[PDB]
A paper describes a structure:
We next purified Goslar chimallin and characterized its self-assembly by SEC–MALS. Similar to 201phi2-1 chimallin, Goslar chimallin forms a mixture of monomers, defined assemblies of around 1.75 MDa, and large aggregates of around 10 MDa. Cryo-EM analysis of the 1.75 MDa assemblies revealed cubic particles approximately 22 nm in diameter, paralleling those formed by 201phi2-1 chimallin. We obtained a 4.2 Å-resolution structure of the overall Goslar chimallin assembly, and used a similar localized reconstruction procedure as for the 201phi2-1 chimallin to obtain a 2.6 Å-resolution structure of the Goslar chimallin tetramer, and a 2.3 Å-resolution structure of a single protomer. The NTS, CTS1 and CTS2 segments of Goslar chimallin show near-identical interactions to neighbouring protomers compared with 201phi2-1 chimallin with the exception of CTS2, which is shorter in Goslar than in 201phi2-1 and shows a distinct set of interactions.
In response, one family of large bacteriophages uses a nucleus-like compartment to protect its replicating genomes by excluding host defence factors. Here we find that the bacteriophage nuclear shell assembles primarily from one protein, which we name chimallin (ChmA). Combining cryo-electron tomography of nuclear shells in bacteriophage-infected cells and cryo-electron microscopy of a minimal chimallin compartment in vitro, we show that chimallin self-assembles as a flexible sheet into closed micrometre-scale compartments. We find that the shell is primarily composed of a single protein, chimallin, which self-assembles through its extended N and C termini into a closed compartment.
Numbering used by the authors:
A (entry chain A): 96 to 583
B (entry chain B): 47 to 95
C (entry chain G), D (entry chain D): 584 to 586, 591 to 615, 626 to 631
E (entry chain B): 145 to 193
F (entry chain H): 242 to 290
Write the structure that this text describes.
């Protein structure tokens, strides 16, 4: 078959009436092959060489060949219908002593196939889905852990994931007569905190910047941002889009409980001089200062007061969506809702796209129909930033492999010189740069910093939510009888 | 409590273990060769009953 | 009429400030003489 | 109750700050794979 | 207030353990039973322990 | 690369490898547009004064 890598497909079926429906999960195996070369592209000035990785070879021809193989497997076109349910690249070698990995991959394939069958044929097959009404007779709780020294979280293949902040959502149970106490853990979420340059312009004869109706000091110029890196079940067997919505609600509620997100920076400040020191902002505040400040001998309130002079008192919610992986089939719904309107001719009212409909329907179904009453139909839900982020790992000085996403703005402030900081921020923010140009700039900086000792595995795109939609979602969840009690 | 039975999946990543079966087996195996085979009684109590 | 600038201007407007408080679980003689 | 002052107090209230913007002329694969 | 494993071992637990012990030996007429000690095992038990 | 392990010979002894050069061949499929490379030969050495 005309395919670039050896692949294995796991198939399963379902029958409605007299028809058969088949769904497949695709697994390319690439361990032991040479990495892809660079591709020459066309730019406004001239030609540039752009990096590529494994996923860049999976085009429409590959899909057609996989479909043909699947149809030959079941017997023919008259024996049923076939559809693709997911895709994931396996970058680690498989030997005769890899039973655990095989079992985990089989479980992931089964969950994806079953969820596809439910979404497509639940009404005819009578299959229910999760909603907040099932948590009516119990007490949900939450917890948060700030850890930044040592090993990190890992994915299904075994590669590290950045996990500065971890949030766990559980359920509290008490026996009626025997008085025993227990808890049941449902879902978990990981992420970290980044910074975005955003100066305020007073000289344009505009009004002062107001956050929550309050003015801010003139020296504030950086906007905090939260980036979600992963979400996965703990004791639940099934993980569907509704379960993802529950995880999102829990994370938002926990992170805003008394400015609990700033505890991450305060905790990082305790190590002293290092790649994650928030004291590097002292150079931003006062130009004469040329060396990052050490804040390990200050009390917590002093550090909080220092941070209040340079940061906006609000949080931006973002997410990284991988182009392939264990849960990419689930998370592809976020990019699909970015385009609200198909430009199709309308007799009166413009037609609305299908991805927007799916995301709105999920939000409304989890909350039992209150979101529709709180938020207007057709308002934005998701924005696109336009940045393509690399995925990979490198060797840390403590003996472990670390996520390549450790290189961010604070790392550049603490490790490199100001010219590199300007170049990094510019590739993240300038609007007159194409996607390939930004990719090239970031790749060059990373390669210079790490001396070329790293490995790339994939790509991801970054999206962010609309704050008004999130506020409406929290209010609708409250109106459906759901409450949460953070414990930490 | 019964969410898994409602929203079920065929293959599960968490199966649990049998600590009481493992510990009882080891103790009986140790005792089977000495002269105190009949001096001990092992009782298993589990939440299912 | 006369009168680039670095930074991201749209990021500031997308920050989430506060949420509703209903999502959180609620806790739990002389004068009358005559 | 106890308690001139130089300046014009009415002049500040008659300043025109801003006007409507409508008076100005307007200018002029993996996800979908399966 | 924080809690740990021992906080769940109340009088109901003792009554249930005693009932299981009495069922093991045959009945109330077959003898008398008493508890002699208690210890919590927090580490996993496998076939190599 | 100059920090860490070095290259080795057939017996297993280290070889100084400050500079490493790799010569390859670039291939593109005509119709399916796949990209690949084929690695041929390698060379090691260092710089002296």
């Amino acid at each position: 078959y005309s395919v670039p890598y050896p692949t294995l497909v796991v198939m399963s079926g379902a029958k409605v009436g007299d028809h058969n429906h088949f769904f497949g999960y695709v697994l390319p195996l690439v361990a032991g092959l040479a990495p892809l070369p660079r591709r020459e592209e066309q730019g406004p000035h001239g030609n540039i060489l752009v990096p590529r990785t494994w996923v860049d070879n999976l085009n429409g021809t590959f899909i057609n060949e996989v479909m043909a193989a699947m149809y030959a497997a079941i017997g023919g076109k008259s024996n049923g219908t076939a559809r693709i349910a997911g895709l994931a690249v396996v970058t680690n070698e498989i030997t005769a002593e890899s039973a655990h990995l095989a079992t985990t991959l089989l479980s992931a394939a089964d969950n994806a196939i079953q969820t596809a069958i439910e979404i497509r044929l639940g009404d005819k097959l009578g299959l229910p889905q999760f909603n907040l009404g099932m948590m009516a007779s119990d007490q949900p709780i939450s917890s948060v852990q700030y850890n930044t020294s040592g090993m990190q979280d890992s994915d299904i293949v075994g590669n590290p994931v950045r996990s500065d902040i971890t949030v766990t959502i559980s359920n509290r149970i008490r026996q009626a007569m025997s008085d025993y106490d227990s808890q049941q853990r449902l879902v978990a979420t990981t992420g970290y905190i980044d910074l975005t340059y955003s100066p305020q312009n007073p000289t344009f004869n505009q009004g002062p910047v107001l956050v929550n109706g309050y003015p801010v000091p003139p020296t504030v110029q950086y906007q905090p941002r939260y980036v979600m890196t992963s979400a996965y079940p703990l004791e639940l067997d099934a993980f569907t889009p509704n379960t993802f919505v529950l995880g999102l609600i829990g994370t938002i509620a926990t992170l805003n409980s008394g400015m609990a997100w700033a505890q991450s920076l305060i905790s990082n400040a305790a190590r002293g001089i290092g790649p994650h020191n928030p004291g590097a902002l002292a150079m931003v505040l006062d130009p004469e200062v040329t060396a990052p400040l050490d804040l390990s001998t200050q009390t917590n309130e002093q550090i909080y007061k220092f941070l209040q002079q340079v940061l906006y008192p609000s949080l931006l919610i973002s997410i990284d969506v991988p182009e392939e992986g264990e849960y990419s089939w689930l998370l592809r719904m976020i990019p699909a809702a970015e385009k609200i309107y198909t430009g199709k001719v309308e007799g009166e009212v413009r037609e609305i796209s299908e991805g927007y409909k799916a995301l709105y329907r999920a939000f409304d179904d989890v909350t039992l129909g209150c979101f529709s009453k709180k938020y207007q139909y057709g308002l934005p839900l998701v924005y696109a930033t336009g940045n393509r982020i690399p995925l990979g790992h490198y060797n840390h000085q403590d003996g472990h492999r670390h996520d390549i996403r450790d290189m961010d703005d604070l790392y550049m402030m603490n490790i490199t010189n100001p010219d590199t900081v300007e170049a990094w921020e510019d590739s993240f923010d300038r609007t007159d740069m194409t996607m390939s140009q930004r990719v090239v700039a970031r790749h060059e900086i990373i390669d210079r910093v790490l001396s070329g000792s790293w490995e790339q595995t994939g790509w991801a795109m970054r999206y962010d939510f609309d704050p008004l939609a999130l506020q409406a979602l929290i209010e609708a969840a409250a109106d459906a009888g759901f409450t949460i009690r953070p414990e930490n | 409590r019964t969410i898994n039975r409602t929203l079920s999946r065929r293959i599960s990543r968490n199966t649990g273990s049998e600590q009481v079966l493992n510990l009882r087996r080891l103790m009986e195996k140790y005792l089977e060769d000495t002269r105190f085979k009949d001096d001990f009684i092992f009782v298993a109590v589990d939440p299912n009953q | 009429i006369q009168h680039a600038v670095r930074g991201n201007m749209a990021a500031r407007a997308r920050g989430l400030g506060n949420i509703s408080g209903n999502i959180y679980a609620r806790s739990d003689g002389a004068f009358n003489l005559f």
